[PDB]
Scaffold this active site. Structure first.
Site, PDB file in Angstrom:
ATOM      1  N   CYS A  23      35.051  49.686  34.833  1.00 39.58           N
ATOM      2  CA  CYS A  23      35.919  50.465  35.715  1.00 39.58           C
ATOM      3  C   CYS A  23      37.375  49.939  35.683  1.00 39.58           C
ATOM      4  O   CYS A  23      38.292  50.727  35.663  1.00 39.58           O
ATOM      5  CB  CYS A  23      35.394  50.432  37.154  1.00 39.58           C
ATOM      6  SG  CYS A  23      35.440  48.808  37.986  1.00 39.58           S
ATOM      7  N   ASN A 180      38.406  58.587  39.234  1.00 35.66           N
ATOM      8  CA  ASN A 180      37.301  57.676  38.921  1.00 35.66           C
ATOM      9  C   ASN A 180      36.930  57.761  37.436  1.00 35.66           C
ATOM     10  O   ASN A 180      37.519  58.513  36.691  1.00 35.66           O
ATOM     11  CB  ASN A 180      36.099  57.988  39.834  1.00 35.66           C
ATOM     12  CG  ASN A 180      35.116  56.824  39.992  1.00 35.66           C
ATOM     13  OD1 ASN A 180      35.196  55.769  39.328  1.00 35.66           O
ATOM     14  ND2 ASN A 180      34.148  57.030  40.869  1.00 35.66           N
TER      15      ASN A 180
HETATM   16  N1  LIG Z   1      32.359  48.972  37.063  1.00 33.40           N
HETATM   17  C1  LIG Z   1      33.224  48.133  37.537  1.00 33.40           C
HETATM   18  C2  LIG Z   1      33.013  46.762  38.030  1.00 33.40           C
HETATM   19  N2  LIG Z   1      31.835  46.136  37.892  1.00 33.40           N
HETATM   20  C3  LIG Z   1      31.729  44.905  38.421  1.00 33.40           C
HETATM   21  C4  LIG Z   1      30.368  44.260  38.177  1.00 33.40           C
HETATM   22  C5  LIG Z   1      29.444  44.111  39.399  1.00 33.40           C
HETATM   23  C6  LIG Z   1      28.019  44.626  39.133  1.00 33.40           C
HETATM   24  N3  LIG Z   1      27.188  44.754  40.425  1.00 33.40           N
HETATM   25  C7  LIG Z   1      25.722  44.423  40.154  1.00 33.40           C
HETATM   26  C8  LIG Z   1      24.877  44.574  41.419  1.00 33.40           C
HETATM   27  C9  LIG Z   1      24.995  45.977  42.027  1.00 33.40           C
HETATM   28  C10 LIG Z   1      26.459  46.294  42.316  1.00 33.40           C
HETATM   29  C11 LIG Z   1      27.342  46.125  41.080  1.00 33.40           C
HETATM   30  C12 LIG Z   1      32.822  44.297  39.062  1.00 33.40           C
HETATM   31  C13 LIG Z   1      34.024  45.032  39.174  1.00 33.40           C
HETATM   32  C14 LIG Z   1      35.388  44.672  39.825  1.00 33.40           C
HETATM   33  C15 LIG Z   1      35.463  45.080  41.306  1.00 33.40           C
HETATM   34  C16 LIG Z   1      36.803  45.577  41.849  1.00 33.40           C
HETATM   35  C17 LIG Z   1      37.956  44.584  42.036  1.00 33.40           C
HETATM   36  C18 LIG Z   1      37.716  43.180  41.508  1.00 33.40           C
HETATM   37  C19 LIG Z   1      37.322  43.111  40.034  1.00 33.40           C
HETATM   38  C20 LIG Z   1      35.832  43.224  39.717  1.00 33.40           C
HETATM   39  N4  LIG Z   1      34.098  46.272  38.649  1.00 33.40           N
END
Ligand SMILES: N#Cc1nc(CCCN2CCCCC2)cc(C2CCCCCC2)n1
Length: 213
Positions: A23, A180
């Site tokens: 993202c 998005n």
């Molecule tokens: N796509 C995207 C995205 N995916 C993750 C992985 C987490 C997976 N996690 C696993 C368990 C369930 C929920 C998601 C982190 C972030 C960012 C967040 C926003 C600001 C800070 C930077 C990091 N973005």
């Protein structure tokens, strides 16, 4: 007192990150694309994959910060286009080639934390701005129409990266126009309207930045 940059040619089509945590890379390329249009009068799809693979300070498909991506494009002296370095949805070795270079960056600025006034100024004066939000609620995920406001949204739980492509008012409700990266299928053609000036709903102004060009 509104702007919609999708009308102004600052916004490329909605993309689908798939089952990769990228993202942040779509957020970054989107803010870069806007600035490409602001500076040059034209844009093109830039490469999320270049960022996922080459920004070592981020976690590829496990998340990352937009500021790190902007810093990388600056130091790197470029970012490839989508067509030159296409999106495959998984981290691979960094394969950046300056022959595919489509945009440059000479830094970034961060909007003051929690300040939606400053964010509004930024969107008006810069263009599309990279932001991060709490997108963890079921109600965000099933958004279809209107101005999204949920009282359960957590401003200290930033877990998804998106892109502010404008602002206005709908049926009396001030909003942010959010692009998005969950495909055109999601939301309203890949877009969501999020509550503006509702005490930083979902932490919209807590991690906002744009690239310099
Ligand atoms: N796509 C995207 C995205 N995916 C993750 C992985 C987490 C997976 N996690 C696993 C368990 C369930 C929920 C998601 C982190 C972030 C960012 C967040 C926003 C600001 C800070 C930077 C990091 N973005």
């Amino acid at each position: 007192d509104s702007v919609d940059y999708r009308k102004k040619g600052y916004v490329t089509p909605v993309k689908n990150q798939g089952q990769c945590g990228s993202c942040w890379a779509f957020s970054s390329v989107g803010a870069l694309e806007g600035q490409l249009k602001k500076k040059t009068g034209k844009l093109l799809n830039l490469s999320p994959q270049n960022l996922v693979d080459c920004v070592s300070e981020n976690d590829g498909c496990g998340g990352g910060y937009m500021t790190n991506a902007f810093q990388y494009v600056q130091k790197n002296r470029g970012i490839d286009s989508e067509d030159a370095y296409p999106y495959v949805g998984q981290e691979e070795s960094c394969m950046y080639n300056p022959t595919g270079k489509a945009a440059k960056c000479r830094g970034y600025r961060e909007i003051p934390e929690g300040n939606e006034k400053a964010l509004k100024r930024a969107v008006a004066r810069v263009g599309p701005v990279s932001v991060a939000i709490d997108a963890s609620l079921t109600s965000f995920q099933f958004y279809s129409k209107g101005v999204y406001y949920d009282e359960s949204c957590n401003s200290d739980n930033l877990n998804h990266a998106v892109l502010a492509v404008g602002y206005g008012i709908q049926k009396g409700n001030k909003h942010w126009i959010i692009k998005n990266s969950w495909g055109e299928n999601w939301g309203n053609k890949g877009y969501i309207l999020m509550a503006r000036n509702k005490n930083n709903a979902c932490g919209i102004a807590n991690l906002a930045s744009f690239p310099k060009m």
